[PDB]
Write a protein that binds this ligand. Structure first.
Ligand SMILES: COc1cc(-c2cncc3c2CCOc2cc(N4CCNCC4)ccc2-3)cc(OC)c1OC
Ligand SMILES: [N+]
Length: 295
């Protein structure tokens, strides 16, 4: 209930709204107050968390959804577990990673994504879900070293038996920096659920690139950089990414030092298998989880 939560400090702000660190029965919680322009994302997330009952150790822990009316308006709240280490985008800028730390991050993200993509059968079984806005800022680092995926506002679901696709009704567009080439060229088949899984794998390979750069190998480490930092400006436009990803067919550069570390070699091969211009040639989330497990 929103009445029992004490908003203590704002840890994030954007077009989506605000994220607050709050107290609730003597424990820290995360409260997202949605903006009026992003109401459809609150409905979709409430559906995925309350109706679909999405629950996984590598997905942001749902607590409660609520609506509070004040100042002649009604705010839409989402209350989840609070991770004091912040987003993966924040965490990668404060520390370097070793082999275990890197693999724990990338395997946890892969297992959480595979849980979204894999349909659980039986009655009231979880359908296959695509995130469609996967990025380092939508990934949070837990104190055990593992990560969890957040923001289900753009989720899309599908069930194999009925062959029915639920795209929702959200005017929100995904993050342009992480957009797949089929999205930028407007060739993506919006009626096929596999299309939405393949744009997640594409974006997953970009987060994979961000994390691998922070793994120290032979006293060498790369500074943190967002994908395509050296070709697009801040807040890139649609034409900015299309020129890089589609026209020039550019991908993030694999540092040569990665070939001197066996873990980074298998990781560099993994992200390359997520960046195919042909969406059907990209790996599945299950194959990525399997490949990461054998490493
Ligand atoms: C409640 O709904 C959400 C909460 C969080 C969340 C959860 N737990 C911690 C944080 C966040 C938001 C962003 O990251 C943080 C960052 C910081 N700090 C570092 C940078 N600046 C100083 C403060 C502190 C806490 C968090 C995420 C969501 O999706 C991106 C949410 O919606 C689905
Ligand atoms: N952040």
């Amino acid at each position: 209930v929103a009445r029992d939560i004490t908003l203590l400090e704002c840890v994030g702000k954007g077009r989506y709204g605000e994220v607050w660190r709050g107290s609730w029965q003597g424990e820290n919680v995360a409260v997202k107050i949605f903006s009026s322009r992003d109401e459809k994302s609150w409905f979709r997330e409430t559906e995925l968390y309350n109706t679909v009952m999405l629950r996984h150790e590598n997905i942001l822990g749902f607590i409660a959804s609520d609506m509070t009316s004040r100042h002649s308006s009604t705010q839409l709240w989402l209350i989840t577990h609070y991770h004091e280490m912040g987003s993966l985008y924040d965490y990668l800028q404060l520390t370097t990673l070793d082999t275990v730390s890197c693999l724990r991050i990338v395997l946890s993200i892969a297992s959480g994504l595979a849980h979204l993509h894999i349909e659980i059968f039986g009655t009231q079984g979880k359908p296959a879900i695509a995130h469609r806005d996967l990025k380092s800022k939508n990934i949070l680092v837990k104190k055990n070293g593992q990560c969890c995926i957040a923001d289900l506002g753009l989720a899309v679901m599908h069930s194999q038996s009925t062959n029915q696709l639920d795209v929702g009704n959200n005017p929100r567009v995904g993050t342009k920096r992480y957009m797949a080439p089929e999205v930028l060229d407007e060739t993506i088949q919006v009626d096929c659920f596999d299309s939405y899984k393949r744009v997640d794998i594409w974006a997953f390979g970009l987060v994979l690139w961000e994390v691998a750069r922070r793994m120290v190998s032979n006293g060498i480490v790369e500074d943190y950089k967002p994908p395509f930092y050296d070709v697009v400006p801040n807040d890139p436009s649609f034409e900015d990414m299309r020129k890089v990803v589609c026209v020039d067919q550019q991908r993030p550069n694999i540092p040569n030092r990665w070939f001197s570390d066996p873990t980074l070699t298998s990781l560099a091969k993994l992200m390359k298998e997520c960046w195919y211009q042909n969406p059907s040639a990209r790996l599945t989330a299950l194959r990525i989880k399997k490949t990461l497990t054998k490493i």
